[PDB]
Amino acid sequence: HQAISPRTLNAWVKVVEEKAFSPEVIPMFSALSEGATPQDLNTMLNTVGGHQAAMQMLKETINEEAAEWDRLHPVHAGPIAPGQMREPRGSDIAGTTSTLQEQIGWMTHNPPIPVGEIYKRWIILGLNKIVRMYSPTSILDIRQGPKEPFRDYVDRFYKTLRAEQASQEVKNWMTETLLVQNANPDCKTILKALGPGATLEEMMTACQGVGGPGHKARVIAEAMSQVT
Amino acid sequence: HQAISPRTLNAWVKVVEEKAFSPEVIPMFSALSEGATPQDLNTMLNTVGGHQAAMQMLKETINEEAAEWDRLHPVHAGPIAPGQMREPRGSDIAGTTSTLQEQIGWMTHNPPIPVGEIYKRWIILGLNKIVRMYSPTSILDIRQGPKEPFRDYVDRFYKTLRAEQASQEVKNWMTETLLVQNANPDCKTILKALGPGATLEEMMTACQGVGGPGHKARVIAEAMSQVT
Amino acid sequence: HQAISPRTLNAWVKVVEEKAFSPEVIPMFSALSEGATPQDLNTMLNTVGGHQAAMQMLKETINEEAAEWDRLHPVHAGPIAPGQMREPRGSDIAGTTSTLQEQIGWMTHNPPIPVGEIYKRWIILGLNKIVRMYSPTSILDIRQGPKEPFRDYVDRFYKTLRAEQASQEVKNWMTETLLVQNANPDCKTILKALGPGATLEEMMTACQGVGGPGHKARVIAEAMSQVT
Amino acid sequence: HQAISPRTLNAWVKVVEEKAFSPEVIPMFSALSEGATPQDLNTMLNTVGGHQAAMQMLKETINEEAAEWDRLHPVHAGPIAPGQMREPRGSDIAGTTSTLQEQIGWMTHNPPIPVGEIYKRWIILGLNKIVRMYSPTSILDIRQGPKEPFRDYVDRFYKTLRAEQASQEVKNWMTETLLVQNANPDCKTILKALGPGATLEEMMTACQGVGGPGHKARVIAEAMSQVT
Amino acid sequence: HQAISPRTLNAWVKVVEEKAFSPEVIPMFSALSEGATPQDLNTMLNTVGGHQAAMQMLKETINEEAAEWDRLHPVHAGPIAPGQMREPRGSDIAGTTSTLQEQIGWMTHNPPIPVGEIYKRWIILGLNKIVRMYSPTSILDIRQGPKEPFRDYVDRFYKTLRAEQASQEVKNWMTETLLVQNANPDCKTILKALGPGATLEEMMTACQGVGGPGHKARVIAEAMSQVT
Ligand SMILES: C=C(C)[C@@H]1CC[C@]2(C(=O)O)CC[C@]3(C)[C@H](CC[C@@H]4[C@@]5(C)CC[C@H](OC(=O)CC(C)(C)C(=O)O)C(C)(C)[C@@H]5CC[C@]43C)[C@@H]12
């Protein structure tokens, strides 16, 4: 049997990262998965890096459809007759407790039990649910809350950037611009009043006092003096 | 033998989606599953999307009624009758344990044990409880809290919007109007200060200030100046 | 043989409803259906609710391709063939004049005559034409014509709104806002002169005179007063 | 066999005429007709007076479901049937082809064929379509169009009044009230200028020339005089 | 036998959509189709997309020529002729009631019956009538009538645009630059007074009032003020 080529896996993971589970991933997933055994489907699903929420949703959908298949399709009791073997359970279709040899036997037997296409249908349902209900996070969509500490947002921004898929120079440029650009107006004002090019430690120290008693009293004083 | 059809099941899910678990769903259900085997009832009940809380309540009702049936109706001592007939335990009425063939045999046996009717009654009780206490959520119910950050409110708004059953055009229109309509007065005045047609990122950048020390000082000073 | 399942069919109906015959339905149809007998895609198409014009265009396309298939493939000589059953026609590939046993025999015969794949291709062409040409209707597209009386406007608005797929609360909200949001400047002026919270009957009564001699005289007199 | 009874049928007609295909007619239909042969439900549907569009939609849905049943369930090969009677079809389940004896034989066979329940399910789907789509017409809904001549408005009013089910004194009261209560501002003004108690012929004579050159010129001149 | 090839058929389709039934299509049809069996020209004519009126006229011409051929050539006596196969008929030359084997046998016989050239002559006559009479519809021909409401104008404009042969970017440019260019002086001046870059919905809202009592009164009063 023909397994999944490494170039196929690379293309699948690349489209996964590039489209960020856009609807355009639904067609692509079909195109490179035609005639694929459920073990190959599981391998092609596992290599997707990141997007843990999407993987959780897809696994939940797979489990739901496997349970439905188990309920609708019963099992046969008794010794297995020669010329045949065990009927595919829901997990067998999902490729969790079915060996590759058994899956290939199911596909190539006459009449053929389409374990691969049923599994692909379950994964397609999961992917449709994902593209309907999943909104990817990005370094552009992480900002600082009105009362959130500056240090905590710096740590969260660094974690999100470390989770990003981009070149090192691009990430450094994003650190240079977005950090000051996307911040609490108080934190942004403190950073902008400070000279550009200040180190991260200095910009954290300058914003370490944001939200404290002294800063609140000072800003109240400025507001009261300005209005009056 | 008799089995459910795609048309009736589609109509059932459509009426469930249309009326948000209103009382009008109790008759229609009982009007669609007449003479239905428990497996057909389970398939009818598991196909409704959304309303996870209501479905959880209905399920819990099913388990409690199955436990009551098991308590009231005892099981045999263990030996099997020469007629090869098994008394239906509480679990298998709901279809979790028994298969389609066993349910059909029970429903066709003389005298008939209408397991489908008992399961339908249990599901009816669950639906009655659902309409009694459970209330579905809606996009119009999403309102920004008094101390809520704008980013979290937008996240909640879009999370509820994605699961809502509607078309893309109406969804975009609701995004355009409701999101700025339902907002904190502090957030709403800032949004109204911005001209119409401002993008979502501009809205969030403008509203990032509310609840922070600077915004609080500004509103306090403005109110003090206006009063005196 | 494994036929369609309620989950996949319901997902197909849901994706059709959510995206009103957007291009994204072309791959999903190619993904949910695989190895499906012509009766299976017939069920897959019939359960689609609404979009009667689109379904009519799809049916016309299927008739066109069936006629072309009949034209290109003639009747084999010999009405009786003990070796193998009859050859497919244009209509029975579409499933109108075929039984499930015959379709299964065709798709399983050696060599295979994939009536399912050919029918799927015909429906794919139909959906491509649909997404190329058909424009879905929506409640926001309902707008009062300049000379349209308010009563027929309201009748059309409620007809499309009731044909719309949504919830009761959001439908009531649409009735509250869009009815006066989409109206002629004369009817809009009359309704704005009415205080907010006026009933539908009050609004219909207030706009009964739009287009009559009394209105067409009063507006002209007001304009003459304004410009003189 | 116990067929339908005059009390249940009369109550069915009464409830349909009372709530006018409100959702509350869905349970009663499933309540007043249980165990009914398809001829009984055919009689139940035929005796309904009025609501021609509703019955149009209902029986259209009935033919749709019958065609779907014919598609899914094929004619059994071999006209010979010595052991038992013929298998049902869509039309002969809907009652338009089978006889009462055949329906009774099916509904009491071993195993039974629930012809009555299937037909009741089809009528239930049709009734749900009615209550979702059909809006009853009422005398209070008759309003004169802005450019509609008074004679045709009166003709429409009296046509729907005759179609209305009420008492003669009640109908006379509706004639006395709604005729002048539902009219264009021009016709309303003309009628109010007429003294109360004017006959219908005098009322029609007074509004015979609304929309003619003389009336339009008179109202335009009055508006000009008021403005200047 | 050498049937038609995809390249020539695609070229024929391309020239038809390029010059839109200009006279230059008459030679190409006689050049691409040489020695073609009637089935080949039937395929050549069916693949033509658009120009439904022109194809209907061509079908009418073919029917007329077939009727004339049947009139001038009678059906020879003798139900069965062992010496030679049957003689052609009017509808048979068009390929409606003939198979490819029969057409090949006729076009290759001693003496030959040139069914292909006769059918080609009929299609050439039809094409000549088409190029003489039929005028293709284009997007530039869509102009809104003096009394046409703007909404139906936009509907017609998009309906004809959606059937064009252009690309997406040029289609968007044509929407941007042609909708306002082809409009009534009233609608055009409303759109010019309205700021450039306004959305389609804003434009439709602006021109919703054209043709109503308020707009007519306003323009009449403006003209009266101008000339007095
Ligand atoms: C008495 C007055 C106070 C003033 C003092 C003298 C006057 C002036 O100096 O102003 C001379 C001009 C007139 C007479 C006005 C009165 C009004 C009229 C009128 C506004 C009347 C309504 C008519 O409109 C129609 O015909 C309606 C329409 C839809 C077009 C249809 O049915 O065809 C038109 C033709 C538009 C005229 C124009 C001429 C003027 C201005 C006079």
Numbering used by the authors:
A (entry chain L), B (entry chain K), C (entry chain J), D (entry chain M), E (entry chain G): 12 to 239
Which passages does the manuscript contain on this structure?
The Gag polyprotein, composed of MA, CA, SP1, NC, SP2, and P6 domains, is the sole viral component needed for the assembly and release of an immature virus particle, which is accomplished by the oligomerization of Gag into a lattice structure at the plasma membrane. Cryo-electron tomography (cryo-ET) data has revealed that the immature Gag lattice forms a spherical cage of interconnected hexamers where the CA protein plays a critical role in stabilizing the spherical hexameric lattice before the viral protease cleaves the Gag polyprotein into its individual subunits and maturation occurs. By contrast, the immature CA hexamer is stabilized by both CTD-CTD and NTD-NTD interactions and adopts a more extended conformation with a six-helix bundle at the base of the CA-SP1 domains, and the immature lattice is stabilized by NTD-NTD interactions that mediate the inter-hexamer contacts.
A comparison of the two structures reveals that BVM binding in both VLPs is consistent. To better interpret the averaged density, we modeled six symmetrically related BVM molecules inside the cryo-EM density (left), which was then compared with a surface contour generated from the symmetrically placed BVM molecules. This led to accurate positioning of the BVM model consistent with the “up-orientation,” where the dimethyl-succinate group is oriented up towards the CACTD. In this binding mode, the betulinic acid moiety of BVM is positioned to interact with residues ranging from I231 of CACTD to T8 of SP1 in NL-MA/NC VLPs or L231 to I8 in T8I VLPs. However, the pose of the bound IP6 molecule is altered when BVM is present. The binding of BVM does not alter the structure of GagCA-SP1.
